[PDB]
Amino acid sequence: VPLDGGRFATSDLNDLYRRVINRNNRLKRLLDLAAPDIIVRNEKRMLQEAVDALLDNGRRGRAITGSNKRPLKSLADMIKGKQGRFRQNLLGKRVDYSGRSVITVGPYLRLHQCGLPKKMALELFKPFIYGKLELRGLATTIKAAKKMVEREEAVVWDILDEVIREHPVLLNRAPTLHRLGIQAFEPVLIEGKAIQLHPLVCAAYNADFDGDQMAVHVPLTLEAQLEARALMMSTNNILSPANGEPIIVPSQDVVLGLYYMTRDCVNAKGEGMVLTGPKEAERLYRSGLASLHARVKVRITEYEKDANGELVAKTSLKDTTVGRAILWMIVPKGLPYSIVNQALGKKAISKMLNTCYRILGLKPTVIFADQIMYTGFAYAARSGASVGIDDMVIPEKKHEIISEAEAEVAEIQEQFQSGLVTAGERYNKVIDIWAAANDRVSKAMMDNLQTETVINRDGQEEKQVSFNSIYMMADSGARGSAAQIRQLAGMRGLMAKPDGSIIETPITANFREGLNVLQYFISTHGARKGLADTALKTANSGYLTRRLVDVA
Amino acid sequence: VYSYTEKKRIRKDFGKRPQVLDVPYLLSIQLDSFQKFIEQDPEGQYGLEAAFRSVFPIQSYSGNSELQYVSYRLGEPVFDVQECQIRGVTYSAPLRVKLRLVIYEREAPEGTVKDIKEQEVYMGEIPLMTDNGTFVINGTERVIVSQLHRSPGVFFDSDKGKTHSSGKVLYNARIIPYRGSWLDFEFDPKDNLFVRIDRRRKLPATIILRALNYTTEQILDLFFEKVIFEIRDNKLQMELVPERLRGETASFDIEANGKVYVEKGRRITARHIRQLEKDDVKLIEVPVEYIAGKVVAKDYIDESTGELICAANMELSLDLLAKLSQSGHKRIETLFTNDLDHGPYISETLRVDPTNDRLSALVEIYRMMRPGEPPTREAAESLFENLFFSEDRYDLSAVGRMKFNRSLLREEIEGSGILSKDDIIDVMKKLIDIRNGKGEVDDIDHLGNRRIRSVGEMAENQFRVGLVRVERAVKERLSLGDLDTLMPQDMINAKPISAAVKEFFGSSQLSQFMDQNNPLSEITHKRRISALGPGGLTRERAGFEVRDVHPTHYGRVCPIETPEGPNIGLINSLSVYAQTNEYGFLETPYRKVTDGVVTDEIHYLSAIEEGNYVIAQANSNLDEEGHFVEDLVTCRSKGESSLFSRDQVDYMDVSTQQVVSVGASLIPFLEHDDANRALMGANMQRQAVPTLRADKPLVGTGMERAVAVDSGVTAVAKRGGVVQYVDASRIVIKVNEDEMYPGEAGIDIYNLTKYTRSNQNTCINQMPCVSLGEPVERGDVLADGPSTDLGELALGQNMRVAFMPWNGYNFEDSILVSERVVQEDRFTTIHIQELACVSRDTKLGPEEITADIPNVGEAALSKLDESGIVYIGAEVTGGDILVGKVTPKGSDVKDSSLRVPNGVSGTVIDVQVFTRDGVEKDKRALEIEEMQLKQAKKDLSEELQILEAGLFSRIRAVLVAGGVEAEKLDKLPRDRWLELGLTDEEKQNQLEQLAEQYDELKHEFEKKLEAKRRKITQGDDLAPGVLKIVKVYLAVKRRIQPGDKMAGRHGNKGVISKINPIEDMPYDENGTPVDIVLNPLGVPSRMNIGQILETHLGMAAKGIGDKINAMLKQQQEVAKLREFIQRAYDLGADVRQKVDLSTFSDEEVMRLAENLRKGMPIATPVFDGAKEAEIKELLKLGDLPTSGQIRLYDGRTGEQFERPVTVGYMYMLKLNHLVDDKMHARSTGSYSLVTQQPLGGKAQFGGQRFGEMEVWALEAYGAAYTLQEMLTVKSDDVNGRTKMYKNIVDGNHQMEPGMPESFNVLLKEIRSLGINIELEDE
DNA sequence: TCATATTATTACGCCAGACAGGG
DNA sequence: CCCTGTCTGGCGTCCTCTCACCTATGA
RNA sequence: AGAACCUUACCUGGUCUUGACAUCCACGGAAGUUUUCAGAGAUGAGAAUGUGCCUUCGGGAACCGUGAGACAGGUGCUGCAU
């Protein structure tokens, strides 16, 4: 084929075949003419090398080349390699009725449905719309229907909502590693140009929303619609196939909304009042007469199913909070009240959904996963859980710990000037005292964050776990750990140079205090090594998955 | 004092450390390199003169003619840069070289030549550099990126562990020339020394010594010291210097002087060496078992019989001693082969050597280098004497000789370019010393061992390739030269030089397309140091250590600005203050510290000098004298950050920005961010699109000014003065007299580049930021470019941001945006698309440009004229027609008429047409000809008249010393004017002088306008081949929408999720909604805490802005404004700014306060930024709460959010990953040729590659039918897909699968081998 | 335009697999 | 003849987007 | 839906011939304004004023004059070509 212009961009195999035929014609003419021995030996040898270069180029000494120094691609190089026929056109194919766009959240969704734009929906479903238009009788020939959807008149959007309705689509994030990276949804049409994807499902795709893209595929035939609904639907994938752990675990905002909701404080509005049900618990929270965390005797009716498939009601007064009753309005019947009576971090909400799946089955667990996500988003919005510069509380004991460590390294180096100790024992003693001082700084800040709030109730003071914002983001398990909150308040440890050995002078400044120049440069050693490790680790991880699914 | 656009809006500058060295010109690498390449520099170094003095004078092989050189020159470019980008030509210059051919007679080395000839011949065109550091190669604007490669000169590398699988180290030594053959020495685990040349076969290394005319005895003289056995009274005693016994076991009885020194069994200690030196012990009698393992040094022959006793390098036995003792050779020289220190590596290599003399050594080297073809005396000697020893094919440069003498601890640094005997012998000696223990290896990441190539060096190497090809051509033509009938262009040819230099500037791995969407991105693609390219490492192979940051990067390479992905740490970006060494290394400034007092003199160092000295830290507290206020200070000695004394240091860091680059020193509060998020923040900050309304970062670092000036996107004033401000077309600046030349009266007319296409389809546009009649100074800015605001650098815009979860719409990293952001068009960016249409004559006649578009009805002839082509302007979308361009016979007509692509809208801003000389109808082509024709003359006369007006007044102005008669000077109006005599006393010939000016003005204007019409009157200017050349420039205006990507400066990426109404936003109690809601959960994990301090400090900045907006709106007399502005500019600790505000004339306070009512801009520098107490104190100057947190109500429910939230102003950027460039869908369209599967991409309307892991994921489910239609019906099988399309549109979802076509393609490709693959029984 | 037919750089890192060498 | 360095081949992540550039010769 | 002249296309005489009406060049004159004798009048001969928008000055656009032709003109014929 010619490219855009007036010349033909010729393939490499035409060069190979044209050389074999040029040489073969020369050899026939020389055997006609009775050339001497050395001429026809060179001629047959050039034909041998030409045939051997046509079949598998470069297996002989240095491969032939046309333009410019790059070798030209032979038949065996049309078969082998990453870009042969197996790995590039027979195992993986390019696919019609498919689309691709940037994802975004849309938290109003139920977890069996996803948002799909109107422009992509009218392009992916052109033949179904053509068939629907031809059934009604609005048009006649196929051309008329293609002009109608090329113009996009007022009547094809009702046709589109009547071809969408019960027709699943396969959403697919581009590095699909396990089977939960292709899931089938039902479309809900979107004014917009971005796929709205239900948030819980994101933890299956490893999909954040920092610029990600996903592909949509349409199951055309009827068996494929039934496979998308009965095997690949997103309600059907609620447990990861690698183990027994649920994969529709609530990820980050919703566990903060729950951890702020089901908690307590030693005095609030409506401390120790008594409530006749969870409905008036939410009514007291909404009207402005109690607080979301205020300990209260309620009367809840938990249904324990102790018989053989019969739900027995037991009603009692639990000493609980307001938020635990409001969250009890969403729990299905069979679970006991003690699943919400605690503080509900992330491990606790994961085993809440797991006990709901083991007891009440699939359909209450799907609808209860949605109600968890809705109430987590709503009370995280009502929480106003910001992050400030004052939330990262510096330990008051931090500077004296650093000065005691500086006195200790001064003692060790004064022994080093007088030669009492060895050099390796000096390096070991310095790394040991900076590890001990690091642990003491972490314990100072961790006490100063985990119990900083000290509020009185009707008299003398009484302490409790803190409502500091970074501490709830750490204790809830939403985002953060001990190490990250340690590096934002306490000293950020002893960073290591790329030699593999540690550096004897640590980074005594956290991020709330400023790092100076040398400390940031040592930090950049430690972080450049991590980025290089991930960006080179991913190739071995993918090649390991390939070898494993081809031995299986 | 300040300049006049500095007093417009002076940014509140935190920062305690006084800067001593201002920032160098940020494009100096590119400009200094290319100014070195083209410059007339006598003494030859470096440049084009080095190329001509290497290649010339050419003399042929005794052909008695010798073409020599005189001088070169570069003429004017025929196309200036703008019309060069428009047309598509290179931006080049013709290289006029004077060449002087002299031709000899017979027998004239000394005789005078018989004839000369000389001419200014023309070879090539070299592409000049634009004033901003760019090229224009073929219409497009490209940048050569500076390479980072291994220096020439010896390197002693180890490879300690991986080979031999036994933990035994090797030690190789590579002599890397700048041009020529590579010579490597290397041990092997048998402890033998091996040479290899150009990574070829392995020769035992002493053969190269035997190739340098060294006998075996001379080699053993070099690499071994002699132990002397004297034949004496009995048992052949030994000279013993006591150094040789260090650390060995006493095998025999060590006694002398009648005294037993050391007995057998104990090892010899250094106290025993002191005993032997104090007792003066040299000669001791040895047993016969001591010599029975040693090796002879030189040869010995039996004197009377006349034959050989033993060859050199022969081990000794007792009967050999009975041979040599009875002959009469009294001295025996043995080789001291210490097992600890002085190993016998050369001697065992000589035992491996199959050669004996020089000639067989050269024959074996020639059989190594060029195999098959025979090894004769002349051929092998010419090979080996031109491998390393001739000036043509082997040349360590000056850098190579400096590194080569420095790594061998030589004294000198300048020497000859070739090697010698002594250099190869010294490399072998240092390698042996490293094996013995003394001296150590070199590392390759050490930036003293790592040179930079730049534009001038790379273009000079390519130009030298072209010159050696043209000298082989000149040697060709001259021996076939007949004289005198040729002049020097039948010999020389302009083709190979131009071919080579356009090969490099067009298709190389470093001459690459400029990332141009941003002033930052231009100025940080020009400052780029790539490890890749020719002669360097590759992306997909290496490695771990070359991708990692080494302690010599401090102040030379940015540690944190490197692109994430497949090439991390290969594409390093250069630091802010780092220049380039004379040899090409990276030297960075330091402040010389003689004693306690840190001196303000600067001094540049590279990494092979930074190790020796002790260099302080940038922020170490020194007060009022330079004395370090502590008695101990953190420094770094040899790449090790350690704490040293007050008075030991020799250098200090210059300024605290100097570690990082110009991409990541624009991030305020860098020191509070993590390193990873600073990397992601700088790499995204390169990617910002220019918004429609540029908006001044409230929290900047003060480096915005230098980046926005030094990248040439703003129209910086060349000569200061006032202004005339016609400006609709050009800024016209009248020049003050001190900066103004005596002749060339002169006023500067700046060209503003209005709406045009960038390289990334963004819009580069300049707008004047000075009014009419306003003073400007030299170096001041006049026109704000893209993403600039009054000379600062405004990539994104500053918006009110709340940190809270808001109903899930900002879940992972999403961002929830009000409607006030999209109503104000405060991200509505402008994109420009160039679309070409050509009507080439493929076949069956030429194609045609006519509106008479076929089949298609009264839906073709619409946005066009009666003669075809889009009629300009208009609200064109997708599926429209721009250029009717269709042929007959292609009832056989078709529609190739270039239309508008699917999904885009826009306005036709410009239509260019340099078409096939004929595009015209009956007259538009010549209709506009007269328009431009009359235009030229008009301005030509106008300009003359403009100067004439100024000159006429000037005539009268000077008319005072020679006729001031006001009533006797207003005679003729447009006729003459001055008519008075003068004589002498004072020179008033001024009238005569100005008379010539006007006289020459009119005389030159005619000629100027004479060529104007000549140029005007023309078909059009372009190349041949292509016929119909119609380029149409659309300009889409994209706003913002759910799905775009925004980001701050700290690494906080986001896809804007919901575009809320104004009402539903979280409003504080004052009533203002917040603009953008981010998510707090990103902040504890991604440890980029700097965005919060930017949020609080931007809140304080707009607090001052709201306070000034109240004091100026509710208008107060300027005393209260200058008092509040003075309080705002004093504010807190000891800073550098304060202000001199009472000298702003009671109006420059008000113009400043007009430019501050949107918020007071604050410079928070990079590592010496604003502390937290100053943020709190500035939040107390404004009336804002000290915590940074305001209680916010909810727009939905009207009720307060508990636990007050953070609101502030973050500077958020819109990155050019827009969602309606990514949205794509395909049902059915076109496919490829070879395969039956769909095409790929978006510009090709193609479908999604359902790859391999998705097939494994469908196999993981039970999706057997979904996969079957996913690879047979939807993709490949042609009968299956046509039956499926008809089955769908009938209303029958059922597939008739069949076999994929690409599998039958597989069968024919396998079967086209000798392979019979089939398909068996039914 | 229409047949004529191939030369003057090196700088991955294991990891199997086959091969001449020698105690 | 069983260990053995040494040499030769054969791997090295998926998906996507933007741009430019394409054999010499020749009576 | 209006013939004294005009209208008017008809008759009688007196006259004009690139023309009463247009476009085009060439080159003579700014257009126009006023007034005189002969003649039925058409026309054929005189005296007064003006030079505006712009010129490396071979000159121009409005408005008269002359010659060349290209053309104008025709209420001339065919309503049985329309």
Sequence-distant (≥ 6) Cβ neighbours of residue B1316 within 8 angstroms: none
Residues comprising chain A, all counted: 552
Q: How many CB atoms lie within 10 A of CB A452?
A: 15
Distance from A390 to chain B by nearest Cα, in Å? 7
What is the C-alpha separation between A125 and A117, in angstroms, rounded?
Answer: 12
Nucleotide nearest to B1013 (CA to C1'): E56
Determined by which method? cryo-EM
Residues comprising chain B, all counted: 1322
Residue B1287 in tokens = 């089955």
The two beta strands, B1053-1059 and B1045-1047, are: antiparallel
Asked whether the beta carbons of B535 and B152 are under 8 A apart, the reply is: no
**For position A438, which CATH number holds?**
1.10.132.30
Three-state SS for B1173-1214 is HHHHHHHHHCCCCCCCEECEECCCCCCECCCCEEEEEEEEEE
For B:688-717, CB contacts with A below 8 A are none
Q: What radius of gyration do chain A's Cα atoms show?
A: 35
Sequence-distant (≥ 6) Cβ neighbours of residue B544 within 8 angstroms: A532, A536
For residue A149, the SS3 value is: helix
Across the A:B interface, residue pairs with CB atoms under 8 Å apart total 459
Residues 385-414 of B with CB under 7 A from strand D: none
Q: Which residue among B551, B1053, B1247 places its CB closest to the CB of A210? A: B1053
For residue B103, the SS3 value is: strand
Distance from A28 to chain B by nearest Cα, in Å? 22
What is the C-alpha separation between A279 and A288, in angstroms, rounded?
Answer: 15
What is the C-alpha separation between B1240 and B1236, in angstroms, rounded?
Answer: 12
The two beta strands, B641-645 and B1053-1059, are: unpaired
Sequence-distant (≥ 6) Cβ neighbours of residue B1194 within 8 angstroms: A381, A382, B1066, B1200, B1201
Q: Which residue among A193, A380, A530 places its CB closest to the CB of B1041? A: A193
A contact test, residue of B549, B661, B1091 with most A CBs within 10 A: B549
A contact test, residue of B1055, B1067, B1190 with most A CBs within 10 A: B1055
Burial of B155 (0-12, 13-18, 19+ CB in 10 A): buried
- CA of residue B500 to C1' of nucleotide E33, angstroms: 82
Asked whether the beta carbons of B1167 and B656 are under 8 A apart, the reply is: yes
For residue B529, the SS3 value is: strand
Distance from A303 to chain B by nearest Cα, in Å? 31
What is the C-alpha separation between A66 and B1216, in angstroms, rounded?
Answer: 39
- CA of residue B547 to C1' of nucleotide D12, angstroms: 18
State the sign of the Cα–Cα–Cα–Cα dihedral A348, A349, A350, A355: positive
Q: Which residue among A87, A96, A199 places its CB closest to the CB of B811? A: A199
Identify how many contiguous H helices and E strands chain B contains and give both numbers: 30, 53
What is the C-alpha separation between A468 and B445, in angstroms, rounded?
Answer: 46
Beta bridge partners of B512: B143
Closest CA to B1214 of B675, B753, B831: B831
Residues near chain E (nucleic strand), Cβ < 7 A? B 941, 1006-1007, 1009-1010
Sequence-distant (≥ 6) Cβ neighbours of residue B790 within 8 angstroms: B5, B8, B9, B696, B769, B781, B784, B1155
Cα–Cα distances in angstroms (integers) from residue B822 to residues B124, B827, B1099, B1115, in the given order: 54, 7, 22, 31
Asked whether the beta carbons of A292 and A283 are under 8 A apart, the reply is: no
Residue A265 in tokens = 């404080």
Per-position b or e across A181-194, b if 16+ CB within 10 A of its CB? bbbbbbbbbbebbb
Nucleotide nearest to A61 (CA to C1'): D8
Element (H, E) at B802: strand B797-803
Cα–Cα distances in angstroms (integers) from residue B549 to residues A354, B281, B653, in the given order: 46, 55, 19
What is the C-alpha separation between B1120 and B1106, in angstroms, rounded?
Answer: 15
Q: Do B1293 and A86 touch (CB under 8 A)?
A: no
Residue B627 in tokens = 């004395």
What is the C-alpha separation between B1056 and B1044, in angstroms, rounded?
Answer: 6
Q: How many CB atoms lie within 10 A of CB B767?
A: 15
Q: Do A232 and B1306 touch (CB under 8 A)?
A: no
Cα–Cα distances in angstroms (integers) from residue B696 to residues B25, B308, B1149, in the given order: 22, 92, 19
Asked whether the beta carbons of B883 and B870 are under 8 A apart, the reply is: yes
Asked whether the beta carbons of B296 and B316 are under 8 A apart, the reply is: yes
For B:629-648, CB contacts with A below 8 A are 634, 636, 641-643
- CA of residue B10 to C1' of nucleotide E39, angstroms: 97
Asked whether the beta carbons of B47 and B36 are under 8 A apart, the reply is: yes
- CA of residue B1019 to C1' of nucleotide E58, angstroms: 27
Resolution in A: 3.7
Residue B897 in tokens = 């008429």
State the sign of the Cα–Cα–Cα–Cα dihedral B1249, B1251, B1255, B1258: negative
Nucleotide nearest to B189 (CA to C1'): D5
Nucleotides of D under 7 A from a protein CB: 5-7, 10-24
Distance from B856 to chain A by nearest Cα, in Å? 13
CA B271 to chain centre: 61
Q: For chain B, after which residues does the C atom lie more than 2.5 Å from the next written residue's N, i.e. where is it broken?
A: 890
Strands (E), B151-256: 153-157, 172-176, 183-188, 192-197, 203-204, 226-230, 238-239, 254-256
Residue A42 in tokens = 């060179």
Closest CA to A326 of A257, A244, A419: A257
The two beta strands, B58-59 and A213-217, are: unpaired
Tell me, yes or no, if B1239 comes closer than 8 A to chain A by beta carbon.
yes
Beta bridge partners of B597: B627
Nucleotide nearest to B149 (CA to C1'): C11
Asked whether the beta carbons of B670 and B682 are under 8 A apart, the reply is: no
The values of phi and psi at residue B734, to 5°, are -80, 135
Residue B263 in tokens = 């007995």
Show residues of chain B in contact with A527, CB under 8 Å.
Answer: 674-676, 679
Sheet holding B1030-1038, edge to edge: B829-837, B1030-1038, B910-913
Element (H, E) at B930: helix B924-958
Burial of B1120 (0-12, 13-18, 19+ CB in 10 A): exposed
Residue B634 in tokens = 């953190």
What is the C-alpha separation between B561 and B556, in angstroms, rounded?
Answer: 12
Element (H, E) at B1013: helix B990-1016
* DSSP-assigned states of every residue in B597-640: B--S-EEEE-HHHHTTS-B--SS--B-SSSBBSSSEEEEESSS-
Q: How many CB atoms lie within 10 A of CB B1295?
A: 24
Q: Do B1167 and A517 touch (CB under 8 A)?
A: yes
Q: Which residue among A473, A505, A521 places its CB closest to the CB of B659? A: A521
Sequence-distant (≥ 6) Cβ neighbours of residue B837 within 8 angstroms: B882, B883, B885, B897, B898, B1028, B1030, B1031, B1032
What is the C-alpha separation between A157 and A544, in angstroms, rounded?
Answer: 47
What is the C-alpha separation between B134 and B144, in angstroms, rounded?
Answer: 8
Tell me, yes or no, if B1222 comes closer than 8 A to chain A by beta carbon.
yes
**C-alpha dihedral (B800, B805, B809, B811), degrees to nearest 10:** 120
Q: For chain A, after which residues does the C atom lie more than 2.5 Å from the next written residue's N, i.e. where is it broken?
A: none
What is the C-alpha separation between A516 and B1293, in angstroms, rounded?
Answer: 67
What is the C-alpha separation between B1076 and B816, in angstroms, rounded?
Answer: 6
What is the C-alpha separation between B1283 and B736, in angstroms, rounded?
Answer: 82
What is the C-alpha separation between A287 and A269, in angstroms, rounded?
Answer: 12
Domain residues for A530?
389-537
Q: Which residue among A182, A224, A522 places its CB closest to the CB of B1265? A: A224
Asked whether the beta carbons of B749 and B719 are under 8 A apart, the reply is: no
